[PDB]
Structure 1
């Protein structure tokens, strides 16, 4: 891929992201003043773990579907064999969802957009896993400090997804190639926007992976229990 071919990769990634981002950034920013009251928060805390688990499962189900659609629009993701597509989505989809959260997150008051309004982690008290919820918020807090642009989120989420170290791939070398192409594409774009300094600030890959595994473990405790 030459100059025009790396810039085309950039833009196709930004395209998929734009067409699949679920919630527009301007809407999310405009809504930051729209915050759950004390009665509404208490209304959420009083709900059973089961109903709360139900609303979160639906939220996480809807968010994951847009991520699946993001994948399917990625130049070269289709060219991968169907088996490998599945291995990537299985291991990465929820990780991308975790990253995507930072846009719906207000570091000013440590709140997140949920079901029409902004609220803190104490919204989710009834689930009984604040340590995990607080990790997710902290993760989103430290990402929100980098002020990711829409494009950087596009490229970075592509790279969360396209990872050749996912256990059980069949065409591992072809997944490696695409990954290498996106890495360069991302690095180039950062150089054109004078944003290279974020690279040293990007979390250790094992942070996401570790947080997500902990998230899936609780999710499986939930799925079996209800």
Structure 2
């Protein structure tokens, strides 16, 4: 039996250990929705308190993605420069993809601080167009009904992309990429799920949305710096200043 069957198992294990929120929990909690009063309470919070809360949650989400990457076979054998290039370009893209598990398309709500709420929860941030675009992206992804292994293999490939500008050992990233592509396509064939391939997001769209999102987080961080629970100095240094 294949190195490729083992790679599937190892990527899904890494995802299971780092997925942050369990899918059964997220699905069971869908009926737990913020009340009108609770939504108004969030809308009345300071922009800067909502930013502190959201920035903290997003930092934590990024760190789970870093831990996911560190567990992908061969990722720790890449040189540090390339590790950082890959994580800088792709970790927030993965966070945006992971969001769809916590998104309920029936009422367009996301799981946030223990209950589901719509995008109006975030009104104090004054980012309605960007936040609407983030909700719209999860709405599009939710139509695929991604399984846990599909999310694991797809987000591994979001990260392990040999086309990212600035890699120093491109051939070594290509080797991991090809094996992950084969793992993903083998798994979709085995589960009769190859039809999702044509429905995956155009790559330019995830990159565009992520670039706009990170640009806004950078603006907030310039205006109102946050305390970061920093665990990854080389990555922190690339993003914070």
TM interval, shorter chain, is over 0.9
Per-residue CA shift, 1:89-111, capped at 9, x if unaligned? 11111000000000000001000
Which runs of 5 or more structure 2 residues have no equivalent in the other structure? Answer: 225-241
For residue 225 of structure 1, report the CA deviation from its aligned partner: 1.1
For residue 19 of structure 1, report the CA deviation from its aligned partner: 0.6
Per-residue CA shift, 1:71-129, capped at 9, x if unaligned? 11111111111111111111111000000000000001000000011000000000001
For residue 25 of structure 1, report the CA deviation from its aligned partner: 0.3
Per-residue CA shift, 1:122-143, capped at 9, x if unaligned? 0000000111001100100010
For residue 181 of structure 1, report the CA deviation from its aligned partner: 1.2
Which runs of 5 or more structure 1 residues have no equivalent in the other structure? Answer: none
For residue 217 of structure 1, report the CA deviation from its aligned partner: 1.0
Per-residue CA shift, 1:178-209, capped at 9, x if unaligned? 11111111011000000000000111111100
- Partner-residue secondary structure (3-state), 1:78: helix
Per-residue CA shift, 1:153-175, capped at 9, x if unaligned? 00000001101111111101111
Residue correspondences, number: 224
Q: 2:207 aligns with which of 206, 209, 218?
A: 209
Cα distance between partner residues in 2 of 1:216 and 1:30: 31
For residue 150 of structure 1, report the CA deviation from its aligned partner: 0.3
1:67 lines up with 2:55 in the alignment: no
Cα distance between partner residues in 1 of 2:10 and 2:93: 21
**Misfit runs of 4+, over 6 Å:** none
Residue 195 of structure 2 corresponds to 197
Greater shift after overlay, 166-175 or 144-153? 166-175
Cα distance between partner residues in 1 of 2:72 and 2:174: 15
RMSD between superposed Cα atoms in Å: 0.7
Cα distance between partner residues in 1 of 2:211 and 2:174: 23
Cα distance between partner residues in 1 of 2:83 and 2:119: 33
- Partner-residue secondary structure (3-state), 2:77: coil
Residue 233 of structure 2 corresponds to none
Cα distance between partner residues in 1 of 2:174 and 2:187: 20
For residue 216 of structure 1, report the CA deviation from its aligned partner: 1.0
TM-score under structure 2 length normalisation: 0.92
Cα distance between partner residues in 1 of 2:218 and 2:77: 32
